[PDB]
DNA sequence: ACGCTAGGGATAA
DNA sequence: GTATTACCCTGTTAT
DNA sequence: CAGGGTAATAC
DNA sequence: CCCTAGCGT
């Protein structure tokens, strides 16, 4: 039997690895339920041979919840994170963390829910069918954010930041919101692209969803 | 003075 | 030589 | 967030 | 995603 041990430096195509893989049929409801977020967030899942398989690349600022991430996909993973240090056209120095799955047929069962066009999409009832607490906590640690950020602010109410989407992709997301969960919000804009305002209203019922699966470093995103 | 938005910048996707 | 593919790399901007 | 490129096995 | 200049109490 095969241990990601003695694959985790083995070349891409040696065959040691092709059979580890084989091992690994799908992903636990944990690895998916919280994909679904991941990639309405900040996730990007490609598939470099027209849908046969996906894998999931990652990048993030915050290495403990890229660490994290690779924790969950414990498997699916084989090296720790590449440290990425761009300079941007105006000469600053930004740091990262990258990182990415191998690909495998496990994916497509992710891929195939948004990835239409070749392009990530949002289908009608996505969040009746699948869209469950643990994948809305991980959408707000990517995506999601404070309405009022002034300090001193009382303010409660909550921003889910969806302007990759269209505004008909966006409105059935909050439809789903709305009557799943029971959440009163409602689409803003921000630069012309939609926004999901969560009305401060619910930070109660938002909190309280998203409050079991949210990691530590990740908790100087909400009110107060 | 001080709570609130919407316009807009420099990353963090 | 072709096929393959995970790790990186940069293009680019909506977050 | 999204695509490109290559070095490392396999044939 | 986050900050902040500007209107409205
Ligand atoms: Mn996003
Ligand atoms: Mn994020
Ligand atoms: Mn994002
Ligand atoms: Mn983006």
């Not at 070349?11 to 919280?34: D, H, R, T, V």
């Not at 849908?51 to 990652?58: D, E, I, P, R």
């Not at 289908?123 to 999601?144: I, K, Q, R």
């Not at 309405?147 to 969806?162: A, E, G, P, Q, R």
Request: net charge positive; hydrophobic share 35%; aromatic share 14%.
């Amino acid at each position: 039997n095969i241990k990601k041990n003695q694959v985790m430096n083995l070349g891409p195509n040696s065959k040691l690895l092709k059979e580890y893989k084989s091992q690994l049929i799908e992903l636990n409801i944990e690895q998916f339920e919280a994909g679904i977020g991941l990639i309405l967030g900040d996730a990007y899942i490609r598939s470099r041979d027209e849908g046969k398989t996906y894998c999931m690349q990652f990048e993030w600022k915050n290495k403990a919840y890229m660490d994290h991430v690779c924790l969950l996909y414990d498997q699916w993973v084989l090296s720790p994170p590449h440290k990425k240090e761009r300079v941007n056209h105006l000469g600053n120095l930004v740091i990262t963390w990258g990182a990415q799955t191998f690909k495998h047929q496990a994916f497509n069962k992710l891929a195939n829910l948004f990835i239409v066009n070749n392009k990530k999409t949002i289908p009608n009832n996505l969040v009746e069918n699948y869209l469950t607490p643990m994948s809305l906590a991980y959408w707000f640690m990517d995506d999601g954010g404070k309405w009022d950020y002034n300090k001193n602010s009382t303010n409660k109410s909550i921003v889910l930041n969806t302007q990759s989407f269209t505004f008909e992709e966006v409105e059935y997301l909050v439809k789903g919101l709305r009557n799943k969960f029971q959440l009163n919000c409602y689409v803003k804009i921000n630069k012309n692209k939609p926004i999901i305002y969560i009305d401060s209203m619910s930070y109660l019922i938002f909190y309280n969803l998203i409050k079991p699966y949210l990691i530590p470093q990740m908790m100087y995103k909400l009110p107060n």
